[PDB]
Amino acid sequence: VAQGPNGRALAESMNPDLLSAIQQHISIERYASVTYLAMSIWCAERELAGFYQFFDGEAKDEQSHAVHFTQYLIARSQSNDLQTLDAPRQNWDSLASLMATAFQMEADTTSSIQSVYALAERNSDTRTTVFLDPLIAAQIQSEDQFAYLLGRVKFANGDPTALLVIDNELRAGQTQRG
Amino acid sequence: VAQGPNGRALAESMNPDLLSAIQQHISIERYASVTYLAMSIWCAERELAGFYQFFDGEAKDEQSHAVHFTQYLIARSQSNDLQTLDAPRQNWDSLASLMATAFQMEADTTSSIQSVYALAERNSDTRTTVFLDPLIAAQIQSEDQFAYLLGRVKFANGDPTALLVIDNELRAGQTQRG
Amino acid sequence: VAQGPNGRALAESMNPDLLSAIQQHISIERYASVTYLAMSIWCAERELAGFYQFFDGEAKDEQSHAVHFTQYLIARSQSNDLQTLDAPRQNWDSLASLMATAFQMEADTTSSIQSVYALAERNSDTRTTVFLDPLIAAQIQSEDQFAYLLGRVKFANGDPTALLVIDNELRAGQTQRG
Amino acid sequence: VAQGPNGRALAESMNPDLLSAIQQHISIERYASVTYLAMSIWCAERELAGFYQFFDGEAKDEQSHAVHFTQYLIARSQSNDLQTLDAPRQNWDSLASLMATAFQMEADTTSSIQSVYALAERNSDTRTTVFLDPLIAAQIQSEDQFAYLLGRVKFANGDPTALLVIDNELRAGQTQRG
Ligand SMILES: [Cl-]
Ligand SMILES: [Cl-]
Ligand SMILES: [Cl-]
Ligand SMILES: [Cl-]
Ligand SMILES: [Cl-]
Ligand SMILES: [Cl-]
Ligand SMILES: [Cl-]
Ligand SMILES: [Cl-]
Ligand SMILES: [Fe+3]
Ligand SMILES: [Fe+3]
Ligand SMILES: [Fe+3]
Ligand SMILES: [Fe+3]
Ligand SMILES: [Fe+3]
Ligand SMILES: [Fe+3]
Ligand SMILES: [Fe+3]
Ligand SMILES: [Fe+3]
Ligand SMILES: [Fe+3]
Ligand code: NA
Ligand code: NA
Ligand code: NA
Ligand code: NA
Incomplete structure (x- = not known):
């Protein structure tokens, strides 16, 4: 039995370019998280309490997605590399503009x-x-x-x-077409 | 054991300037109470029933705060001095103006x-x-x-x-960001 | 009524040096979060499942602390400024060394x-x-x-x-003296 | 409507090389089953009752996987061909060596x-x-x-x-990181 890069028993090796891509994607999930936190704050500052609660939850969910990916790398016996996280966007001229950034x-x-x-x-x-x-x-x-x-x-x-x-x-909690 | 100004056993003396400040603050709480009562009436006069119910409750809560302070003076063996209470403001040109006064x-x-x-x-x-x-x-x-x-x-x-x-x-009852 | 830096009605102005200190502290909480995430991963890589579960929860709690501070700035009508987040430490020679870093x-x-x-x-x-x-x-x-x-x-x-x-x-769940 | 090789109505023909590959894989699942049975016995012989119970269950689960594949061939109107099953490995010098074989x-x-x-x-x-x-x-x-x-x-x-x-x-039943 071979050992993977993170030290665990290795079921099958992973291409280093794919590993790098997954590590980068974890940063994207983490960046989505802090972006939605910033959006939740922007909404709270304007008394849009329902939008604040929505984006507060989205921030937590995106973080959970990031952790889910870290667990996959563990399961594949691959190293994690938690990266520096950019500051999010924090200023919007309108809720419509904020929602466009959220969709993007x-x-x-x-x-x-x-x-x-x-x-x-x-x-x-x-x-x-x-x-x-x-x-x-x-x-x-x-x-x-x-x-x-x-x-x-x-x-x-x-x-x-x-x-x-x-x-x-x-x-x-009415947040979808249903 | 020494007796405090209100006659009860005295755990520790209180500076008379501090006592006066607490007695004055009790009046501030009582004045907030009657101010919120006046605001509740203003809202009721304009059929703003939710704002009326909100300020009716705030008036009761501010009175409770005043009583809470009177109990602290009792606990400190200090005299209470319930003061003349000014009439509240009663006229506003708009709900936004009333809410500004409430925040103040x-x-x-x-x-x-x-x-x-x-x-x-x-x-x-x-x-x-x-x-x-x-x-x-x-x-x-x-x-x-x-x-x-x-x-x-x-x-x-x-x-x-x-x-x-x-x-x-x-x-x-949706009165806060939550 | 005055408006605070974040646009909300201002109960009392805040010294800009204090505001900066709170914004920096939010980054410290966020950095503790990602540090505990990195520690949870290190433990998971070595099959220390109880330590992994512990630090996974600590990461979530530190993030909650950060959000709690962002809500205080909102409540004070002060601007939030979510900052770039450093990458955490990720390598330790032993669990004892990891726990020393955690305590620090x-x-x-x-x-x-x-x-x-x-x-x-x-x-x-x-x-x-x-x-x-x-x-x-x-x-x-x-x-x-x-x-x-x-x-x-x-x-x-x-x-x-x-x-x-x-x-x-x-x-x-036996994580304290009790 | 055409009839498949096993006599049932045929939704879509299957490449014979793919069919052979699935039949061979069923043997792999069955071989994993009897391998885990042998491992359960090895552990029981050394009073490692928890490992015995674990591998006893794994043997049953691998057999269930084999049957699951036989049902897919039935569903595809393809013939099953249950093959001779090799004897499993039965001797290990240590539990660590047994677990390495299990991982493999x-x-x-x-x-x-x-x-x-x-x-x-x-x-x-x-x-x-x-x-x-x-x-x-x-x-x-x-x-x-x-x-x-x-x-x-x-x-x-x-x-x-x-x-x-x-x-x-x-x-x-504590068999995973959790
Ligand atoms: Cl808008
Ligand atoms: Cl953008
Ligand atoms: Cl108005
Ligand atoms: Cl006034
Ligand atoms: Cl150690
Ligand atoms: Cl360190
Ligand atoms: Cl061993
Ligand atoms: Cl072997
Ligand atoms: Fe996501
Ligand atoms: Fe998303
Ligand atoms: Fe009060
Ligand atoms: Fe009040
Ligand atoms: Fe904290
Ligand atoms: Fe902490
Ligand atoms: Fe305290
Ligand atoms: Fe299987
Ligand atoms: Fe298996
Ligand atoms: Na309208
Ligand atoms: Na309208
Ligand atoms: Na020992
Ligand atoms: Na021992």
Whole structure:
């Protein structure tokens, strides 16, 4: 039995380029987390309590995704390399602009997973594609959800009354088409 | 064993300037109470039932704070001196203006506590600073809450539709960021 | 009513040096979080599942502390400034060495709070000292706990048998003197 | 409607090389089963009751996997061909050596699935890749688990005291990092 780079027994070696791609993706998940924290704060500063609660939870969930990836590297006997984390964006001129950035963040998270996926396929790493499959499925749901929240906020067309109604929807947990 | 000014056994004497400051602060709490009663009436007169219910409860809570201070003076064997109470402000041109006065009242209540606190520290009265600590903590929460209600009302920008939505939030007990 | 730097109604202005100190402390909490994540991974890589579970939870708790501070700045109508986050330490020669770093991290977290506390006192910011008081109390408990875990691991004196026993204690939730 | 090789209605023909690969893989699952039975006996002979119970269950689970594959061939209207089964390895000089063989058996089971998977992809057999996906996911978990048990036994470094502690973990059902 061979030992993997992290010292554990090695079921199958991993291409170093794929390993690097996964380590970078963990940073993307962590960056999504702190981005959603910054968004939660921006909303709290404007008394948009439902949006604050929503993004506070999204921040925690993205962190959980990052940890989920660290556990996969452990399971593959690969080294983790937790990286320096950039500061998030923190300023927006409107809730619609914030929601556009949020949607882009979600879509960019999927693109990162897709890039890891393509590298795993090039390397015939079926463990990794199988690991990623349910994460892509979750991303479809999150993209659908963020398109819903962004589209609903855009429909409000900057009317504070409409934004208060939507804020109350989010506080109540009404965050998807359902 | 010595007797304190109110006749009870005296654990430790209190500086008369500090005593006067606490008696004055009790009046501030009582004045906040009747101010919130006046605000509850103003809201009721305009059918803002959720704001009426909110301020009706705040009036009762501020009175409870006043009584809490009277009990501390009893516990310190100090005399209470219930003072003449000014009439509250009773007229506002808008709910936003009323909420600004409410926020100021809350902040001024904290300033009064802070002034008592500084005098207690100058007099090395650790019982009093310890007594006040949780009241300051409660004030932070109340200031955060009143900034939320004021900011949400200002966001409404005088639109009756938005103010009805917020009124219904308060009736439902949705009075904080959460 | 004045507006604070984050746009909300301002109960009382905050010294910019104190604000900067709180923003820096939030980074310390976030850095403790990612440090404990790195420690959880190191333990998982060596099959120390109880230590992995312990530090996984500590990472989540430190993040919660960071968010708690961001909410205080919101409550004070002060701007948040989420900073770039350094990469954590990730390599240790032994569990005893890891636990020494963990204890130091906990003690350094308290020192950071103490530094903010002293600045608040210099500025007569009683809201901030009151906010910090229960966090210092929690730090005493965490320092006591980490001294217990470190001391118990050192008592094991590198014997794998003893470290397996302690690992099982942590998995069972036996993490303090009790 | 066409009839498949096993006589049932045929949804889509299967490449004979892929069929042979699946039939061979069923033998690999059956061989893993009897290997884990032999390991359970080796442990029972040395009073390692927790390891005996663990491998007794693994033997049953691997047999269930074999049957699961036989049901897939039935579902595809393909013939099953249950093969002669080699005798398992039965002798080891130490528990660490046994656990190394167990880890290798688990990794080799995954390699067999991976080989079937690659053949299905070459043949555009999407039913088979979909069938195998959750089995690969289960293999990741089993490899992580066996790396944990092997690594924990190696950490014991042949100390009977440590091996008794781990034996008791397994008897209690503590068989993974968790
Ligand atoms: Cl908007
Ligand atoms: Cl951006
Ligand atoms: Cl208004
Ligand atoms: Cl006034
Ligand atoms: Cl050690
Ligand atoms: Cl260090
Ligand atoms: Cl051994
Ligand atoms: Cl062998
Ligand atoms: Fe994510
Ligand atoms: Fe996401
Ligand atoms: Fe009060
Ligand atoms: Fe008050
Ligand atoms: Fe206290
Ligand atoms: Fe902390
Ligand atoms: Fe800590
Ligand atoms: Fe199997
Ligand atoms: Fe298996
Ligand atoms: Na409107
Ligand atoms: Na309207
Ligand atoms: Na021992
Ligand atoms: Na021993």
